[PDB]
Symmetry: C3
Subunit: 332 residues, 3 copies
């Protein structure tokens, strides 16, 4: 059974086919690829674009999406095995996935880390549990990686440069400020797809404490070796932005501080100058800027950068709809 858990699990040819089908759907939005079919969209965290784009995508392809929010409308779910369920959780994923598998044709799941222990969050227990117990394809709607974002992002870049071949472009994945410590998912994914695409990638962040999990630094290293791009870590803003073709920002909490955020607060707070502004974007080679959204203006990026013609964030957001339809069609 094929699932869409990570682009890293798919061959380059398969990913190219997806992006091309995405472009095709963007030109002809209505179809019958999901006629009479359905997808269960399970959300354990907030969402506006993911929920909306999947729901509409199912509709446009003749199917129907059922939105569920365990703990809100649906019952809270247990993922640990062999435990005595006498706590808050009402039922086990074993039953949940099998039941939904008797109803829908696809299952999407969004589940951010709990931020108490990275050793546990990095295991990707929720997504893996769904893939294990579900008799139907599972789609990652963002857990510790965000593959749907990767493809929406990739497509937006290919459209902007007018070519599927991004090899040679200088890509800067930069950490940016946010009052709270957030998920590394988007950064992990950006690093993954940018290298898989063969670009010259620089991970820019305040300190070594903000370097991404080794798993992704390794995926990237492997992708570079296979695509022909390059990877490097930098803590210097001016040199990183220098001559960049693409700048993608996202804020995330330092991994070593999971379960202990009080001390990383004063740290991130002394780096709010990492905000993407006009000055930094001026150091780029007329590069484009993007963000996965939601974005806090004048914190993560200034109003000027957001409203600049070089910002393609709205296009990337739109592409979530198109690439996801390509994914659902491929899995059904």
């Amino acid at each position: 059974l094929k699932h869409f858990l990570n682009t890293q699990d798919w061959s380059r040819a398969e990913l190219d086919a997806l992006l091309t089908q995405a472009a095709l759907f963007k030109r002809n939005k209505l179809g019958s690829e999901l006629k009479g079919k359905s997808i269960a969209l399970v959300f354990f965290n907030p969402s506006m674009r993911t929920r909306t784009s999947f729901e509409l995508g199912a509709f446009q392809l003749g199917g129907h999406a059922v939105v569920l929010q365990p703990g809100k409308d649906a019952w809270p779910i247990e993922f640990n095995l062999g435990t005595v369920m006498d706590g808050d959780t009402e039922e086990h994923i074993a039953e949940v996935a099998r039941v939904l598998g008797r109803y829908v044709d696809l299952i999407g799941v969004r589940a951010f880390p709990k931020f108490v222990d990275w050793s546990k969050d990095r295991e990707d227990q929720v997504l893996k549990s769904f893939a294990k117990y579900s008799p139907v394809p599972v789609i990652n709607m963002e857990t510790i990686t965000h593959p749907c974002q990767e493809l929406a992002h990739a497509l937006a870049l290919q459209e902007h440069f007018g070519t599927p071949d991004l090899r040679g472009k200088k890509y800067v994945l930069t950490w940016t400020y946010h009052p709270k410590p957030l998920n590394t998912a988007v950064a992990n994914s950006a690093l993954t797809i940018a290298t898989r695409m063969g670009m010259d990638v620089t991970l820019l962040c305040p300190t070594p404490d903000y370097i991404l999990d080794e798993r992704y630094m390794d995926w990237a290293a492997q992708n570079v070796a296979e695509s022909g791009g390059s990877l490097q870590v930098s803590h210097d803003i001016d040199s990183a932005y220098a001559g960049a073709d693409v700048v993608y920002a996202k804020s995330w909490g330092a991994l070593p501080f999971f379960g202990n955020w009080e001390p990383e607060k004063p740290i991130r707070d002394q780096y709010q100058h990492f905000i993407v502004d006009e000055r930094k974007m001026a150091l780029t080679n007329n590069g484009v800027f993007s963000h996965c959204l939601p974005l806090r203006r004048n914190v993560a990026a200034t109003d000027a950068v957001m409203d600049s013609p070089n910002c393609i964030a709205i296009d990337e957001a739109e592409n979530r709809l198109h690439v996801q339809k390509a994914i659902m069609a491929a899995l059904v």
Copy 2:
């Protein structure tokens, strides 16, 4: 780009066309006016009829509605410009409206005042922000005015009297009791459409403190001069109801008490006799009674009045479905 923010923005001919299309849809509910199209229904406050009627209306016309609740499922939204978003809001309406504009064909928004400062609430910031940043038509699902209610109400009256011409009827918009200070939206709209329809309107309320915002008293004055009706304010129950053809009740908080509700409580509490009962309705010319709903029985109106054959509230509620379909069809 044309939006449906207020009936006051539309010409009488356009409004008549809407009401007529509403009557047409009421006779033939299924259509293809929205085939393959979608509408995002953004709710910042509770709703049963508005959510249900729009959702079903989209379905019956071949489209699909996506229901969003910022702060609940979707992310909380910032509307102020140039602010540093380091608070509760996650993203700006600038991005939200542009993103949704890449997904849906129409955007509906419901956002009641915050009740802390009428100077801010009366600016209609949320609705205006959506209309400004959205590349697609925006529909007011109730902010400080409730135009969809206006048309459902108007249609119900025309059906009841068997004619589109309501000129000459005595219309009584009366404040009624409620334990809490509420939105003036429905009253502002009733005053607006009743005068635009050319009826003899009397705004009945406990004290001068409950008179509606000047903006609407002026719209009404202008509508009367153009339609041939009349407008007057009254604090005397018996004389207001006398010979009335239509009685529309709604409770709202006194505008001068915004941000300071503790003192207006003992005030409204000494006027719970404004409740619409049989005695008052007996002073009318066999007039009809209606309310936008939700209605608290034996507080806003007695059981007898609600169950009287002269109450058309259920018909008005039904008409929300029909007039809204006419609105969506016109804007698409």
Copy 3:
């Protein structure tokens, strides 16, 4: 007007027709029985299967389901008559049911007891109020009985044994452990349908305090006399399971303790050995096990029993979809 409030209200022939149509729909899922029609699914409590199956069922039959959650999105509702609504509730069911009746073709409602007073909960006020004021058919999505579950359960048993005739099988409805006192609805319904099907039913529970409401013990007694089965109450595990053909477990709070749960806690806690495990299932005649779900593993039933090939809970859950489509089709 015909509603689906309880299987007890329907003749055996009608119930057989429903189950057969359910089997038919299971073979041919897509249809036009609800083309252009809609159903309002009103939930006053959590749900995953009921919400999902009804929503998808409406879709597969060409209709649309509108999901409402009073107090969450829709306004809170009052059910008592003649009361002065100056409390938490915003509107009365009288208006709610009549309004929805102008929008949808069917209304489903889920409302668990409040657990404060069984004298009030057993009156089934919410379901009865909807049936009284609604101009369209009402479907019980679980209140104090769960008829939709009954049919999904019955169908699953008929499929398992390969025959519609279950007369002669030993059916064991057993109470099982749960940290909290729950609704008796599922047990009341299991007792009702198992006897209506003519099986030899044994209600197994810790003490006389856990015997179901007389209303259902009487329905069962009447069903046995008409179907040819049998009914008996037992507080002895080993003898009850002995030679059983079917074992259905559910935990519920002792009725005499409504409004006073502190003391029934130490009681249920001394009976956690009622958990369905391999030992007990070994005493059965290679019997099947099922549960309505959600189920807490290693509390209500062990992992081994849940994963045993004799567990048909997933099949029963799937059947909720099929029997409900048969119900909606019959009522429309």
